Amino acid sequence: NLVSGLIEARKYLEQLHRKLKNCKV
Amino acid sequence: NLVSGLIEARKYLEQLHRKLKNCKV
Amino acid sequence: ENREVPPGFTALIKTLRKCKII
Amino acid sequence: ENREVPPGFTALIKTLRKCKII
Description:
The complex is a heterotetramer, with two copies of chain A (about 25 residues) and two copies of chain C (about 20 residues).
Chain A: H1 2-22
Chain C: H1 7-18
């Protein structure tokens, strides 16, 4: 499903970015 | 495209993905 | 996915993992 | 796609590079 794909890709990207931000150093 | 970034973001995405692919392991 | 946040992104990150970065 | 590869990717890459340091 197109929108499911989009929001899941967004969630994945966002979650990675959040972890990599929280890493801080 | 008028939105900006796109072509550079794409270029960087491709270049980095290719550089990483050359890691081969 | 095939519009925005294209497969190339996921593929890059997968390649980064495969390369043994994380 | 009108807005392909969003600022979020750049922010991710930046934070990745920061986290990596190297």
